[PDB]
């Protein structure tokens, strides 16, 4: 319990490198790594039974990782902002440059 409002932890930049991927439980760490393997060593974060996160080095890759999910129906990939957007939405016009 503490009073007053001060600073402390720095602020993190837009979560672009991160990608929200939702795959079926049937999947596994092998399916993820292997899939994204195209890029190389990555950090797969297990959130929920069907919720996972992906981390990349360069933003460019994002494009591809997104162009692949387009046709891919089994799984779905989207930008961190795009994903969260649904859950919470501040005050800023929204746009859907992708299916939807």
Description:
It is found in: Nucleus; Cytoplasm; Nucleus, Nucleolus. The modification N6-acetyllysine is found at residue 70. Homodimer. Found in a mRNA decay complex with RENT1, RENT2 and RENT3B. Interacts with KHSRP. Interacts with CELF1/CUGBP1. Interacts with ZC3HAV1 in an RNA-independent manner. Interacts with DHX36. With 100 residues, the protein is of the alpha+beta class. It has one domain: RRM (RNA recognition motif) domain (Alpha-Beta Plaits, 2-Layer Sandwich). The chain contains three helices and four strands. It has helices at 29-36, 59-71, 80-87, and strands at 18-22, 45-48, 51-55, 76-79. A four-stranded antiparallel β-sheet has the order 2-3-1-4. A hairpin with a 2-residue loop joins β2 and β3 (51-55). The protein starts with 17 loop residues before the first strand and ends in a 13-residue tail after the last helix.
How do the SSEs run, as a string of H and E? EHEEHEH
Helix count?
3
The rounded Rg comes to 16 Å
Secondary-structure class: alpha+beta
Spatial separation of the terminal alpha carbons: 45 Å
CATH architecture: 2-Layer Sandwich
Q: Judging from the principal axes of the Cα atoms, what is the shape?
A: globular
Taken together, the total number of domains comes to 1
In helices, the fraction of residues equals 25-40%
Strand content: 15-25%
Neighbour order of strands in the largest sheet: 2-3-1-4
- Care to count the β-strands? 4
Subcellular location: Nucleus; Cytoplasm; Nucleus, Nucleolus
Organism: Mus musculus (Mouse)
Subunit structure: Homodimer. Found in a mRNA decay complex with RENT1, RENT2 and RENT3B. Interacts with KHSRP. Interacts with CELF1/CUGBP1. Interacts with ZC3HAV1 in an RNA-independent manner. Interacts with DHX36.
Family: Belongs to the CAF1 family.
């Amino acid at each position: 319990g503490s009073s007053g409002s001060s600073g402390g932890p720095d602020l993190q930049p837009k979560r672009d490198h991160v990608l929200h991927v939702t795959f079926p439980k049937e999947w596994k760490t092998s399916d993820l790594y292997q899939l994204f393997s195209a890029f190389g060593n990555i950090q797969i974060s297990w959130i929920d039974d069907t919720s996972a996160f992906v981390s990349l080095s360069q933003p460019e890759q994002v494009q591809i990782a997104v162009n692949t999910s387009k046709y891919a129906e089994s799984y779905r990939i989207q930008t961190y902002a795009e994903y969260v957007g649904k859950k919470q939405k501040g005050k800023q016009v929204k746009s859907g440059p992708s299916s939807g």
